[PDB]
Design a protein around this ligand. Structure first.
Ligand SMILES: *[C@H](CC(=O)N1C(=O)C=C(OC)[C@@H]1CC(C)C)[C@H](C)NC(=O)[C@H](CC(C)C)NC(=O)[C@H](CC(C)C)OC(=O)[C@H]([C@@H](C)CC)N(C)C
Ligand code: NA
Length: 254
């Protein structure tokens, strides 16, 4: 297929409201689970023609997946997508909206940036317990609120392959190496210039563009709407910047 010079999943599939939703992982290293349930929510809606229009529970995946790593201390993408295929994930929104089966237990906080929420700080929550119970007001039993995928896969470490996957099947999850200067990001096209590694981060790629001849990926972060560009950031595209093209994972419902 011919790849357009820009693409925005929010513009292709505007009925799928999850695609334009920015979440907040709070005082928890649950980026791996947020990028997963966000892209899964998007792809569930896109690949079902808008029939499965849901917000999947970050806390269900975070608390119940035994193979996904260390919970709030960080996790692993492949096993998150396998969990969705095999066990599936219930619905659940933010602490503040408290919709769906299992809403997130942790409140919105600022991630090394200024704004209207309390600062996240340096102290981490304990990983929540796997409770397998829908909130009292939600009248579907937990097991019957599960949304499952059919397949999960890593995407080839090829710019055009990543672009074709996003354009055909929807937003993808992606890992990258976070350096200290990423914490100073306010706007524009990020590339690593200063600072030491802080480990890995997992995000959702929703599209791509070019500004002043500089190509970028358009990415949803899970640090609330005050961070970056109303919750989004852009990062150099085509040079495997911070390994952004090398840890892409996704999957399909059919
Ligand atoms: C989510 C990313 C994140 O929340 N943060 C940052 O990247 C930087 C931050 O603030 C300075 C925040 C909050 C932290 C201070 C806690 C999450 C921490 N990252 C991960 O889960 C990544 C995801 C991949 C796909 C990039 N993976 C890891 O951290 C892995 C997880 C284990 C289970 C393998 O852990 C490590 O890389 C590492 C070792 C266990 C490696 C043998 N540690 C735990 C950093
Ligand atoms: Na901002």
């Amino acid at each position: 297929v011919e790849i357009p010079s820009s693409f925005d999943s929010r513009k292709k599939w505007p009925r799928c409201k999850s695609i334009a939703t920015i979440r907040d992982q709070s005082r928890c290293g649950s980026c791996w689970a947020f990028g997963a349930v966000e892209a899964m929510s998007d792809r569930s809606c896109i690949q079902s023609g808008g029939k499965q229009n849901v917000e999947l529970s970050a806390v269900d995946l975070l608390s119940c997946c035994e193979s996904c790593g260390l919970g709030c201390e960080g996790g692993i993408l492949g096993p998150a997508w396998d969990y969705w295929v095999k066990e599936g994930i219930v619905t659940g929104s933010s602490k503040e909206n408290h919709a769906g089966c299992e809403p997130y237990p942790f409140p919105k906080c600022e991630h090394h940036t200024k704004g209207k929420y309390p600062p996240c700080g340096s102290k981490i929550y304990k990983t929540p317990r796997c409770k397998q119970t829908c909130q009292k007001k939600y009248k579907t039993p937990y097991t019957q609120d599960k949304h499952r995928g059919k397949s999960s896969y890593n995407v080839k470490n090829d710019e055009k392959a990543i672009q074709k996957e996003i354009m055909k099947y929807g937003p993808v999850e992606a890992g990258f190496t976070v350096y200290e200067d990423f914490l100073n990001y306010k706007s524009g096209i990020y590339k690593h210039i200063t600072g030491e590694t802080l480990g890995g981060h997992a995000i959702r790629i929703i599209g791509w563009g070019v500004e002043n001849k500089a190509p970028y990926w358009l990415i949803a972060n899970s640090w609330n709407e005050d961070w970056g560009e109303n919750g989004y950031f852009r990062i150099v595209r085509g040079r495997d910047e911070c390994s952004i093209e090398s840890e892409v994972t996704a999957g399909r419902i059919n």
